[PDB]
Design a protein around this ligand. Sequence first.
Ligand SMILES: Cc1cc2nc3c(=O)[nH]c(=O)nc-3n(C[C@H](O)[C@H](O)[C@H](O)COP(=O)(O)O)c2cc1C
Length: 169
Amino acid sequence: AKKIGLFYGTQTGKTESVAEIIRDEFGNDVVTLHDVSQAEVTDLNDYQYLIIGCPTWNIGELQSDWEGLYSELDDVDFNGKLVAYFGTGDQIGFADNFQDAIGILEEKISQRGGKTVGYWSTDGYDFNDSKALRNGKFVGLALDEDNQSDLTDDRIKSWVAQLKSEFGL
Ligand SMILES: Cc1cc2nc3c(=O)[nH]c(=O)nc-3n(C[C@H](O)[C@H](O)[C@H](O)COP(=O)(O)O)c2cc1C
């Protein structure tokens, strides 16, 4: 009815499109979408299950709107919440900072108490470095519409089935 809050930020809409797919994969009224460009850090307190969507830009930078909300995280609490992350990036043009955005967001949110779920395998990706890594895996679903648009849909399906399990749905 109302359990998972998906807060996303997007520059050219790729991340938003993925967010809508994620929503449809979860089932009737489970997930609600929220453009962080119109959100206050306190909106995240209304959910015990969160999905953070954010593309990486300008070589390792958080998407514009997320950058603004990011600064307010240090004053909020995420303890007791399960948080998953996903983002669009470009492993070819920016192999050294692939998906840094979700890595940055995850570090901060986990630091504030959020427990991360939804770890994703790096197998099948071609990149050099990322701030979104932990124990050999991405801290969230890594999508690449610029180079692997053909893999996004099945990657989302797999990830949602994984989260349905990890969220205990
Ligand atoms: C100037 C510029 C810088 C970019 N930098 C990065 C980067 O550092 N890391 C990454 O993974 N992708 C990077 N990208 C690729 C975007 O993340 C990718 O195209 C993404 O799908 C955009 O999603 P959005 O439309 O949701 O903003 C960059 C793209 C441009 C045009």
